[PDB]
Amino acid sequence: GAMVIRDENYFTDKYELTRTHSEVLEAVKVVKPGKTLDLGCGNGRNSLYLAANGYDVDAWDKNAMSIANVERIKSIENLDNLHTRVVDLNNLTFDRQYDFILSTVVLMFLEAKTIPGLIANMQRCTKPGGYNLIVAAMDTADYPCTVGFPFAFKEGELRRYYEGWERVKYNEDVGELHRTDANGNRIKLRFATMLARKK
Numbered sequence: 001g002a003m004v005i006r007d008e009n010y011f012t013d014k015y016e017l018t019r020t021h022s023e024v025l026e027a028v029k030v031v032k033p034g035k036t037l038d039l040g041c042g043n044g045r046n047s048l049y050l051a052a053n054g055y056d057v058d059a060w061d062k063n064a065m066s067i068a069n070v071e072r073i074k075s076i077e078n079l080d081n082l083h084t085r086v087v088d089l090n091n092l093t094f095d096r097q098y099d100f101i102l103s104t105v106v107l108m109f110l111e112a113k114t115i116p117g118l119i120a121n122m123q124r125c126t127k128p129g130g131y132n133l134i135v136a137a138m139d140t141a142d143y144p145c146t147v148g149f150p151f152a153f154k155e156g157e158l159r160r161y162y163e164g165w166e167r168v169k170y171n172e173d174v175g176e177l178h179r180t181d182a183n184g185n186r187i188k189l190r191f192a193t194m195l196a197r198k199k
């Protein structure tokens, strides 16, 4: 009989994908299966894990090839509850209500002028009791952006956006990019990480 567990190794070991994001794995201990939106899904590590575990996933990205790859894997695995779209997040408005919206390591790639409108759109489209998970690069006095991302959160800025939500988790811890500097050392930067629940 076919083994039903779909853990953080499943898509990782079968389709050469990076392991499911640590914050997605944590989030699901708290966030129950529901209508989900993965904004900038890439090659789908997070959308695929979610859909395989009962979440109804809208998985969106600008990269047509990345979307094709998600669709390829979706077809192989019969993930009926995973739906894809090639979208430009800089030029996008949406209107469906969701239990869970996540954007993991995507927002720093967007135009700075997109962010206020997108975050407001995210909050608008979360159900009361629903959750938003965001992880994104920052640019701070102690950890300046050395990559030149077109956007990065300032210290305290993500928290300010989500005033009035319950911040189940919020930190601006120093992390590392995978890309390296002139001496081959991983680039150190703070990331804003938040799991927040709407009242």
Ligand SMILES: Nc1ncnc2c1ncn2[C@@H]1O[C@H](C[C@@H](N)CC[C@H](N)C(=O)O)[C@@H](O)[C@H]1O
Pocket: 021, 039, 040, 041, 042, 043, 045, 046, 060, 061, 062, 063, 066, 087, 088, 089, 090, 103, 104, 105, 106, 109, 110
């Ligand atoms: N303007 C844009 N609209 C939609 N997606 C974008 C845009 N700019 C960058 N992206 C996507 O952001 C993704 C960033 C990747 N690091 C994948 C993040 C993915 N959420 C993950 O946790 O693996 C890429 O797949 C890009 O195609």
